[PDB]
Amino acid sequence: GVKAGDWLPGFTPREETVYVHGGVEPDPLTGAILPPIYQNTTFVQESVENYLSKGFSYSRTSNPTVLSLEKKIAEIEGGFGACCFATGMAATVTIFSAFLAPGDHCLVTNCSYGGTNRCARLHFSKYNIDFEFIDFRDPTNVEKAIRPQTKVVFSESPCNPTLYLADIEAISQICKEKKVLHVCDSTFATPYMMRPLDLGADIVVQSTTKYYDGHNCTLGGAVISSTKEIHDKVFFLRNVMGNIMSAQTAFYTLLTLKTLPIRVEKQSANAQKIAEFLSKHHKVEHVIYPGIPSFPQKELALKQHKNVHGGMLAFEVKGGTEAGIRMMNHVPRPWSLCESLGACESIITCPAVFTHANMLREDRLKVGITDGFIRVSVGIEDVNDLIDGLDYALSKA
Amino acid sequence: GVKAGDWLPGFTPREETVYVHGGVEPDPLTGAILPPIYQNTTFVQESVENYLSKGFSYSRTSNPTVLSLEKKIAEIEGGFGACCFATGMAATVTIFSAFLAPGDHCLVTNCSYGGTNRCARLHFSKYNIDFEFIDFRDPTNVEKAIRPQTKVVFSESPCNPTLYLADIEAISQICKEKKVLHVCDSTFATPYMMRPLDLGADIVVQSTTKYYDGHNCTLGGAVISSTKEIHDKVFFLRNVMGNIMSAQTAFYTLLTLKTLPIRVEKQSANAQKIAEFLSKHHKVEHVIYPGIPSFPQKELALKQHKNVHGGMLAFEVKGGTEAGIRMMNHVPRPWSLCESLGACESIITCPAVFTHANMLREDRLKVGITDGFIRVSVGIEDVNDLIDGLDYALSKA
Amino acid sequence: GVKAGDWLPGFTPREETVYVHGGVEPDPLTGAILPPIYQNTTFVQESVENYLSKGFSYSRTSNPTVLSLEKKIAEIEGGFGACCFATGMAATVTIFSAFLAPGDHCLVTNCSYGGTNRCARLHFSKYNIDFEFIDFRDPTNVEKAIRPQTKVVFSESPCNPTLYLADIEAISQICKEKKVLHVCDSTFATPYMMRPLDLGADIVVQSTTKYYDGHNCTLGGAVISSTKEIHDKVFFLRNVMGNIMSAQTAFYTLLTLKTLPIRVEKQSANAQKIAEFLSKHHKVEHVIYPGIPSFPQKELALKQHKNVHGGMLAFEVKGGTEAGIRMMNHVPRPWSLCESLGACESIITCPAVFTHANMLREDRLKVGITDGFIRVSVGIEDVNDLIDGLDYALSKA
Amino acid sequence: GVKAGDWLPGFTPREETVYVHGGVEPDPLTGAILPPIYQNTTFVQESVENYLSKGFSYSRTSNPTVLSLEKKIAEIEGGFGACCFATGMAATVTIFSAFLAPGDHCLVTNCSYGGTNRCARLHFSKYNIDFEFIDFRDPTNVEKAIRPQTKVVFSESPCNPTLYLADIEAISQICKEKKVLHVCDSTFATPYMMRPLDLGADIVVQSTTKYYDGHNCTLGGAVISSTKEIHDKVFFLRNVMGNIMSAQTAFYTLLTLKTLPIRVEKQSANAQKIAEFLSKHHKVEHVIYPGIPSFPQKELALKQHKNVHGGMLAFEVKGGTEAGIRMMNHVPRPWSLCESLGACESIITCPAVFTHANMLREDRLKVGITDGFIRVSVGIEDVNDLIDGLDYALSKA
């Protein structure tokens, strides 16, 4: 006896259906196909007794539009619950705030996002928290590096900007047996390519700014928790630290998430062809893309990546920094010379003076951010226009 | 001598690149990759002499965000210029307002969009303007129906909701020879499948609400003009009618247009599979989709449609109206029972009681909207969820 | 037995309370103190039978956020119902579209808003509608000018930009006995100063752009109807012409209307002091403000204006157009040299080359838009900064 | 030699002018009177050399709309610079994060905002930071409580919800002599009533949610710094914490700040009248408002408060908790029973079960939140509707 507005009972909706409809039904009051934007601070209570009977009191704590996005994200990432934040850094900082105390040790990937690296080194370390930056490419490095004071292992795959991979399943099995919390930043992957919670991760952190949005429109962060206990701690501390996502940002992201599968398919198809083109180019030294046959962690990429190998690639121009700068300054439209990634608009970044400018050169070269190192975020433009643009820039390099 | 931020001189961006970047450059003041939202009524003038030296005065006349979208839409549709409106109906009535006067004749497709039919019959006819509703499937019907008083031939392809095609190139040749304005409503097609301006149409009307948006988010209309003289007349009357698009709507549509190609490709692939499924179902009498062999105008569809056959399909359920209603009442999620189309969310409607209810039964049967006729807007959900839903709904009909 | 969330029975809330709370209760679903933004095209229906059971189908026809604003505006203006439009011109054009047909005569104030004047002359007159521009300052002029074909009398008070007044009560009594529709554009007045529906007007038209908004934020129009019959005709034709206000604009205006009383009180207090200052200035020829004792229609102003005499004033600089241009070019911040009015930001406009540039000089001088004629919209800045700015500009004139 | 669009050199705009125009000029590109909304994550760079030549790179670090609001807030509060945050709690925790380390001591008012109390006690205390809660009504309590480890003295005036005053000038003198940072939360005051930076405070924290917004529309926080050195530390850590305000929130707050003076004047006039009414009501035990003679700190209120005594008042209903609850349950419209304050909409709350429920009864009585204690946020409705509502509610207590 299923009528209009009901799902078929005992059917799990397929992946793409969840991206379109996840966590959202038509507005009960009006039938509005999209959830209305609760651009609203406070919620009126029926009485003192029925406090929070309608589930809302204050937008810093929870907001109906934000909760809709959180339900969708929790379904897509395969988690118990999600908390949405003003930014990805807010999401990351909340993890470090909640699960680390003075005396605690934290293993972080040495090729973590520059922001995650700095907020560990230049802030949370002042609370006598020891962050140790190690190579996550070999899971035994993680297992051997775990101390009695280790509370959190913070993986990132692919890594910003070197695109190093971490065996999330193998690291998760090590963290389970050692009773350590495994947090994974899968911003570069998206849940369409890799869901760390499916591979035994305790917590996933997303910069929704990048691919979730994918339109260079909004800042956003998400923490997706494997358990209620972890979710409740994140939720409690988000309310205290006042870094929740806004209703308007949640509305934008609810809209953009709908097309993430078709966007990432197109970006990844463009990225494959661009990586192949760059790998044949006589003025390109190295190309890094998980999808080209020369990728050093090809076997882990093939085990861990579903559907695609992503929109992110990196390469090095022959002739060091000078050639890198010449190319960068001569990369024409439709390319954009700027920070960020994961957008419909193709972006070319130089991580040395943009994103990892606060890292010492000796340290930048140690991790793999080399002299002429270019990070590329592939958009959904015609791939021939993108290759034309790179070919011109490389000719001028 | 071309640096970053410049297009290569003498090169034209390819189709998908125009959807991403068309009519938009980074903000000259800040470098903002997206153009800022000019949520702003009035513009300060440097002096009385330098009035409109910066190109803006009042947002009813023109707004920078709206102009950015208009430049993109003009590039995508292949027109001299575009004017953006609050709705597709606003765009349509501005055409009727500008180009028709008492004693003038207007030929309109008899299977026009319901609202277009009504704004003609129930409003503009009171100004002694003669609207004649004819079958556009045979171009010689148009040639033979044109009078000395005929100012506008108003085609729609595919037609709402019967999906009849009009030979835009043949009708354009007739209209040029008789020196009549050929206006084409290509809302159902999108410029990704068919650009009427490329086929000799003088004006294109779009409901940007449908596919341009494709997220059920905003109302909008566009008029794309072949010439400066037509564009200037539409621009002038828009300022008078006060039916310009808002900056916020234009920003939304600037974002959603970027993914129109990948959305329409996905919707069209789903539609092909759904049309094939319905064509073999014993409770389905007829299926209308330009991409299946049973389509009456397959020759014109193959000549006129680029890339895809679109996200719109129709079918007739056996057992007439009662069966149609029983089916509609039992169409489960992820289907939405509502008006509108072209969205990521799959939509199903019975045009007899929703959109074409003001047309008496005798005439709605005469045009092609039969008793059990269903209009289907295919979204980007997993096609197996959409087919399973239609299959269950059909079991109750 | 009144609980929290209920009004006291048999109590009419006072004026300022209606500006804050009019047409809006907490969201039934969540208790959200502000109504959520229905940024949404279409509404899902329960079944074919319960079509429109939740009151919404398509946002071009009606939207929940727009309906909330319409309820507030109808209460504030003292009307049966209100329809909100994309712009004030859209509201005006819809009145002319609905209530005028070929052969019909329409009496308009010769000092009507430039846009209203042009849309009558340069558009609707092509439908063989006769617009006669007469002096509305004497109500007997209106009574004597009424022909057998007169369907609409279109008053404006105060007039843009000359601030001439029309006796709305006297014109209403003439229109009732002659069976003619009385439409009043009270944009310049606001319902806080003058409600034409209270003075027997059949229809009020508002540019909500000006004072309703009062922040230079949004474009908007409102038609407030005295009867259901008139409201239903406006509503029907708004849906056909697709010129409805957007949910986002309605949300902005719901927010800004809350402070209209305190804004207009402050603007009017500043305007009184500025008008007094200008009336004493040795380089100012004439000052027009309904609140200064020299105002030619002082007696009608005192009868017709409640609370205030408005934020709009006008003056003429001695030395003709050259002195007018010198002053205009030397008016410093916090003044803004631009079009529009009614905003928190003080605006100075020259109607000759800004707003009435399409009117012949001989015609501009005939109506009272003289050589050195300045229109002033007074904001809520410190009046001493505004006077300082004018005094400097006048010194340079 | 000053033309239109320029401030007169050597003149400072007066108070109300700064609220309207502060930190904002017409858009240099278009002349847009309001600054456009930079709904935009990343900013394109001209070259590698000219990195940040246009002042922006990534919206987590800085955004043009947010910077415009920060310049306005810095001017209004009389600070070197301001940083804007997602919430007031984000602003508060950024102060604690930046200026406290393990072994450091922090003096906080014992009648602080509930959330501020909890973020100290239940989070930052885990970093071995000693928070001591003392009575700020006597400045010698602060002087005697300061240790060699004291880095921050965190005052709040008026205090939430008891409306106790702190002598900001006296506490500032003590803090300067002991070289301790004086941070003042003046959310309840607004800069229209009290600017702590003028009284020697090193940092001001604002919940812009409350009075800056005043429309129950947006969440927001501001940190206004006395010096560049303090500002740079707050700016740096905001980028790390990822708790910056969104461009859309900043646009809303840029608009609402314009009317703060006229809003607060109206709210304060209503509050005075409500406080006087409650002070004579037989069912009211105590009334707390700085503007009535019974206010314990009337001497400090007259010295410290400019223009008004604010929109916040408190009272104790006779018959303890039961009576308080019966009253709250029967407070009619236009009152709203909810959390938050400072809005156009009058708000009433029992802080025992809403805001200060996590504080055990023994301590909440010790600080001043008595059994029948009611916090009242007075809006801009007609005062007779607000008094009639309180009168009815009191009849049921």
Ligand SMILES: *Cc1c(COP(=O)(O)O)cnc(C)c1O
């Ligand atoms: C961008 C990014 C972040 C930080 O997210 P924001 O939204 O920029 O604060 C964290 N991790 C990775 C991998 C990122 O790319």
Ligand SMILES: *Cc1c(COP(=O)(O)O)cnc(C)c1O
């Ligand atoms: C929807 C539609 C219109 C009208 O557009 P609105 O945005 O709804 O006003 C016109 N033509 C066609 C073919 C449509 O589908």
Ligand SMILES: *Cc1c(COP(=O)(O)O)cnc(C)c1O
């Ligand atoms: C501005 C104005 C209008 C037109 O309204 P818009 O919102 O600008 O379309 C009409 N009448 C008067 C008196 C006006 O001032």
Ligand SMILES: *Cc1c(COP(=O)(O)O)cnc(C)c1O
């Ligand atoms: C509300 C409030 C805060 C916290 O601000 P949010 O915007 O709610 O995070 C801090 N201090 C005071 C005095 C407040 O009233």
